[PDB]
Amino acid sequence: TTALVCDNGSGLVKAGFAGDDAPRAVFPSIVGRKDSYVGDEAQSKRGILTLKYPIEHGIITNWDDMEKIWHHTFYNELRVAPEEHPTLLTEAPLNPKANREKMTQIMFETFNVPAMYVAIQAVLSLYASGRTTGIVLDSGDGVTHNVPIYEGYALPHAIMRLDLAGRDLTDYLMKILTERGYSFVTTAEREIVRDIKEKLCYVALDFENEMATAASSSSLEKSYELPDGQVITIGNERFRCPETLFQPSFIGMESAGIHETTYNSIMKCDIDIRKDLYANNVMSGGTTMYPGIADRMQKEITALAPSTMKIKIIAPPERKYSVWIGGSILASLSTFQQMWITKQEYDEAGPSIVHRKC
Amino acid sequence: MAFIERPEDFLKDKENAIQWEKKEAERVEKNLDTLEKEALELYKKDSEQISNYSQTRQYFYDYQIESNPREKEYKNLRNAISKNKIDKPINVYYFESPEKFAFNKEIRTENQNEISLEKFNELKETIQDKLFKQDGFKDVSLYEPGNGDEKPTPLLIHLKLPKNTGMLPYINSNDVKTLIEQDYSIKIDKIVRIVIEGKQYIKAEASIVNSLDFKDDVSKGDLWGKENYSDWSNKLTPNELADVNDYMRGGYTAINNYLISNGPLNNPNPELDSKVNNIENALKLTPIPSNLIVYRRSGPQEFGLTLTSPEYDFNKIENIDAFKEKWEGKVITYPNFISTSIGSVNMSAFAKRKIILRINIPKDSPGAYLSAIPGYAGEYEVLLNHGSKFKINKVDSYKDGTVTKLILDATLIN
Ligand SMILES: *[C@H]1O[C@H](COP(=O)(O)OP(=O)(O)OC[C@H]2O[C@@H](n3cnc4c(N)ncnc43)[C@H](O)[C@@H]2O)[C@@H](O)[C@H]1O
Ligand SMILES: Nc1ncnc2c1ncn2[C@@H]1O[C@H](COP(=O)(O)OP(=O)(O)OP(=O)(O)O)[C@@H](O)[C@H]1O
Numbered sequence: 001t002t003a004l005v006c007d008n009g010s011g012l013v014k015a016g017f018a019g020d021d022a023p024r025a026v027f028p029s030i031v032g033r034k035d036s037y038v039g040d041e042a043q044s045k046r047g048i049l050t051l052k053y054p055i056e057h058g059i060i061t062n063w064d065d066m067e068k069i070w071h072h073t074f075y076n077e078l079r080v081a082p083e084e085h086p087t088l089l090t091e092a093p094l095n096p097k098a099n100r101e102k103m104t105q106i107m108f109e110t111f112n113v114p115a116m117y118v119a120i121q122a123v124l125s126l127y128a129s130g131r132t133t134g135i136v137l138d139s140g141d142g143v144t145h146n147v148p149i150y151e152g153y154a155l156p157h158a159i160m161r162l163d164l165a166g167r168d169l170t171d172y173l174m175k176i177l178t179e180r181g182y183s184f185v186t187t188a189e190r191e192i193v194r195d196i197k198e199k200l201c202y203v204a205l206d207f208e209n210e211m212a213t214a215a216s217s218s219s220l221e222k223s224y225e226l227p228d229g230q231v232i233t234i235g236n237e238r239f240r241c242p243e244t245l246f247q248p249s250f251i252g253m254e255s256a257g258i259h260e261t262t263y264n265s266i267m268k269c270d271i272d273i274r275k276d277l278y279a280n281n282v283m284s285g286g287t288t289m290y291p292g293i294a295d296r297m298q299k300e301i302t303a304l305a306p307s308t309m310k311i312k313i314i315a316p317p318e319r320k321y322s323v324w325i326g327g328s329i330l331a332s333l334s335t336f337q338q339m340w341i342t343k344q345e346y347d348e349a350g351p352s353i354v355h356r357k358c
Numbered sequence: 359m360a361f362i363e364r365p366e367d368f369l370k371d372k373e374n375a376i377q378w379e380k381k382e383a384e385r386v387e388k389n390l391d392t393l394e395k396e397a398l399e400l401y402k403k404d405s406e407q408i409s410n411y412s413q414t415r416q417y418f419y420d421y422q423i424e425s426n427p428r429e430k431e432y433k434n435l436r437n438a439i440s441k442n443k444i445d446k447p448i449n450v451y452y453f454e455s456p457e458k459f460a461f462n463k464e465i466r467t468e469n470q471n472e473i474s475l476e477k478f479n480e481l482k483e484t485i486q487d488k489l490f491k492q493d494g495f496k497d498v499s500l501y502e503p504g505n506g507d508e509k510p511t512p513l514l515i516h517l518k519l520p521k522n523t524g525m526l527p528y529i530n531s532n533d534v535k536t537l538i539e540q541d542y543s544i545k546i547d548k549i550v551r552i553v554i555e556g557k558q559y560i561k562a563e564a565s566i567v568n569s570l571d572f573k574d575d576v577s578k579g580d581l582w583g584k585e586n587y588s589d590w591s592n593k594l595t596p597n598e599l600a601d602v603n604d605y606m607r608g609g610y611t612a613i614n615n616y617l618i619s620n621g622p623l624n625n626p627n628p629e630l631d632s633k634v635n636n637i638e639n640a641l642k643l644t645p646i647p648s649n650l651i652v653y654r655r656s657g658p659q660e661f662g663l664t665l666t667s668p669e670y671d672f673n674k675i676e677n678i679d680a681f682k683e684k685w686e687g688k689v690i691t692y693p694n695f696i697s698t699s700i701g702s703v704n705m706s707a708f709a710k711r712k713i714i715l716r717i718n719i720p721k722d723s724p725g726a727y728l729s730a731i732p733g734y735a736g737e738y739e740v741l742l743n744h745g746s747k748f749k750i751n752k753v754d755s756y757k758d759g760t761v762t763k764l765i766l767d768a769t770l771i772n
């Protein structure tokens with residue numbers, strides 16, 4: 001009778017109970033390749049094994065491995081029986097229909113849940129801040145999206161994707177630290193550099209200015225203690241790393257940066273709602289956590305929009321879990337209870353019941 | 359004296375051509391609303407720029423295209439031309455710069471009267487076995503220029519236009535003119551050396567090849583794709599349907615890096631070999647049902663460059679020269695499967711890519727509109743078979759903001 005919320009991401013699964021204000025479990029979205037290995041316990045047995053990520057750029061690409069993630073979620077992380085709980089799953093913006101159907105089939109036929117639902121991640125994030133209209137920038141470990149939403153409805157023709165997110169930033173930071181004279185190359189070293197990224201990076205308001213400053217000050221230099229006790233120094237790499245989001249050319253990508261995808265997304269929407277979107281730019285996901293990202297987005301969008309436009313970037317402190325929080329609120333709503341797809345409805349209509357959405 | 363039905367080619371009958379086209383202008387003026395007339399009048403005042411806009415308008419973001427005020431003129435003049443379709447073929451005449459057909463040197467100087475034999479064979483070797491894509495507004499003549507006519511280049515195009523070709527005869531000051539919007543590729547069937555008023559000219563006997571080119575009209579394109587490939591994932595044997603989806607959902611990287619590395623010869627692999635075979639025959643299932651133009655914004659490394667290569671800076675003219683010298687007129691092979699789109703518009707994911715491959719695909723080539731599958735990553739995508747070969751007919755350049763980008767007019771030769 002307590003509903004479960006499972007927010008399955010490229011890097012992390014966030015899972016818990018509807019009604020809670022935070023996920024009780026957050027663990028890596030990895031499988032080792034129940035003798036087979038998942039989650040935190042698959043990292044240290046790699047191994048006669050290497051790590052596999054079943055979700056790539058927000059999309060489930062291996063269903064066998066995803067069943068193991070989900071098994072691990074129910075039995076090892078939450079310690080519940082799936083037969084006893086309605087289960088809210090999250091999906092990427094523009095997740096293919098057949099993918100949605102397969103998630104539904106697995107929940108009912110493999111796991112035997114009494115009911116379930118698939119929600120769009122960006123929409124939940126928006127709901128978490130009590131909004132039903134706005135443009136979400138959702139940036140995680142594997143993918144980033146702009147999703148404009150109007151009165152609860154995602155507008156799919158205006159959704160902008162970038163296959164550039166947290167992991168690319170980590171990997172880029174590895175390279176430029178290595179160019180500094182360090183050596184960060186192994187899988188373990190990638191985790192360390194991820195931790196450095198999460199603790200010391202930031203987005204410059206003016207990148208070219210901040211690069212000039214870097215050659216002068218050391219008020220930008222910061223240090224970091226490695227597990228073996230070597231203390232390393234990091235300088236202009238602090239802000240060159242997340243600068244990649246605004247300049248994907250830093251990692252050899254020729255896509256629009258996130259300010260430009262935000263603007264593009266708004267321009268693909270009906271002229272009459274564009275001011276609503278400009279005034280409700282909402283950020284979510286771990287890769288939006290950089291100090292300074294909101295100010296920089298404000299400035300970049302201002303440079304692109306009409307001089308009379310009112311622009312507001314909303315970046316809540318909780319935004320690293322706002323998808324999950326959104327799902328927890330949603331699944332608890334009285335008006336949502338009629339929306340669950342029950343097992344009987346699945347029996348009656350099959351996987352394609354997800355598109356009618358009961 | 360004139361027959362009471364026009365010929366298909368007025369030849370040197372300048373006098374009947376002009377009088378006939380003068381009456382046609384007068385008839386056609388009765389079918390234009392004032393927006394069309396206004397568009398015509400604007401064209402007489404500002405020809406070069408309106409024509410230039412009509413050649414490259416389709417390469418920008420859908421929202422940039424739509425916000426551009428030059429669209430009104432483009433759309434209304436296009437409509438004026440489209441109204442007036444000829445009920446049988448007609449041949450036309452106009453001069454063209456040789457670099458238009460990728461011959462990037464003078465045939466002869468305007469002071470020379472004669473054209474060398476080697477010049478002639480070099481032109482012929484450059485411009486044959488080639489389909490050259492044409493776009494935009496052009497003024498053409500219904501008669502062959504003669505003594506006293508303006509002759510700005512040594513290259514005369516003598517082009518046959520088929521039935522249902524839109525043509526707009528009109529008057530400008532004291533000249534009778536004829537306006538078309540080019541929307542086809544031309545085949546130079548034969549060149550011959552003629553003389554007019556004491557100078558040698560090349561005369562190109564040319565005809566047209568039609569192809570579906572959706573340009574920025576991705577909705578029409580997508581309608582066309584869906585209504586041609588709806589059945590398509592029904593007709594796949596289950597073994598093919600998996601490998602396709604595997605490819606589609608990130609498998610392409612493994613499969614294509616395998617092909618590019620000559621895996622099947624070097625370190626062969628039977629599993630994904632059957633995958634290449636299955637995807638291929640899946641592409642043979644509903645072959646491309648019309649001649650079709652598709653677009654691909656290419657990564658610089660498809661052409662031996664990187665983001666940081668100084669020769670990827672096409673704002674510098676010599677880098678464009680160098681690129682032409684390397685690639686124009688060459689055939690090019692993709693050991694991998696390759697993705698293309700029905701749409702010409704720029705997109706967020708490739709917004710900064712500088713090299714656009716604009717490909718002619720003959721009817722019945724292997725390929726499929728993969729974007730007839732609901733929710734596929736590729737935007738309006740057409741997938742072409744591994745080992746495809748493309749002849750690069752011609753390289754053009756245009757300005758996207760301050761950045762110079764290239765359009766490679768190319769043909770799938772299998
Ligand atoms: C949105 O964006 C991605 C991928 O878009 P692409 O179509 O560029 O991906 P590709 O796999 O086509 O490009 C792979 C990279 O390798 C280069 N490439 C491709 N083919 C060759 C050959 N034959 N030789 C040398 N290099 C090649 C490309 O330049 C590119 O850098 C997808 O999700 C879309 O939906
Ligand atoms: N304080 C921080 N600063 C910068 N990056 C962070 C911070 N905290 C987490 N991250 C990054 O955010 C990413 C994880 O965020 P999240 O869980 O939203 O992504 P995901 O849902 O796993 O992936 P995706 O949404 O792309 O499928 C990781 O790359 C992580 O390094």
Ligand SMILES: C/C1=C/C(=O)O[C@@H]2C[C@@H](CC[C@H](C)/C=C/C=C/CC1)O[C@@](O)([C@@H]1CSC(=O)N1)C2
Pocket residue numbers: 011012028029030039040043051141166167168170171187190191194
């Ligand atoms: C605190 C934490 C955050 C996190 O997001 O981890 C996720 C999951 C992780 C899985 C692989 C490793 C060995 C197993 C780790 C257990 C990790 C908990 C790690 O691979 C990431 O690190 C990648 C690589 S580096 C980066 O930028 N993304 C993202």
Ligand SMILES: [Ca+2]
Pocket residue numbers: 008009010121140285323
């Ligand atoms: Ca996520």
